Symmetry: none
Subunit: 66 residues, 4 copies
């Protein structure tokens, strides 16, 4: 009924495993948030990139009318 | 005793895991905080884009 | 030769692109280190799991000796 | 005037960019602490695995 020494060891290691495994949900939550933030930044860079192209075209066009 | 040693090892390792779990919480909060700063930056940038595009259009181009 | 106004607006928006790219690069480095941390945790989980299966087997064999 | 508002916006943009940069410095620090805590956990887990498997074998042989 009570645990033997070998069973006690086993229980301890199983407890450690579940605990390492359960770190998953929290890590995935953080990871998702970090990944989402990266894309936000990337969209901002994308729009600025578009602004630079728009202006570069206008600058190149205007010079033509010179 | 050897038993005490093994027990302190299990408790420390346990606190460490819980602690890591908390750093992840702190990270999440830090990311949400940066998310407001990014919204502020995007607002500034969108206006900056507007400014240069208007100024470059009115100057016929 | 001094920059015209249009050229100045161009320079300004270009700087802005380089600035945002830098912010983006700093963030992506950290993001890669975080991804890497998750993989390490997976490996650890994988090793403890394999250890658990090992102990299980031994607990079974130690009990089967009882006969 | 236009200078006042214009200059004001050039400063707001630069300030918000530097502030995020600063926040990124704090993030980097937490990323480092996370990694180190994980290094430590890898060590403790390697030890616990070795310990229990050793004990498990001595019991099967005794």
């Amino acid at each position: 009924q009570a645990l033997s020494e070998i069973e006690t060891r086993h229980s301890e290691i199983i407890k450690l495993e579940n605990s390492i495994r359960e770190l998953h949900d929290m890590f995935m939550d953080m990871a998702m948030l970090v990944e989402s933030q990266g894309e936000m930044i990337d969209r901002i860079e994308y729009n600025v990139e578009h602004a630079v192209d728009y202006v570069e075209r206008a600058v190149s066009d205007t010079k033509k009318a010179v």
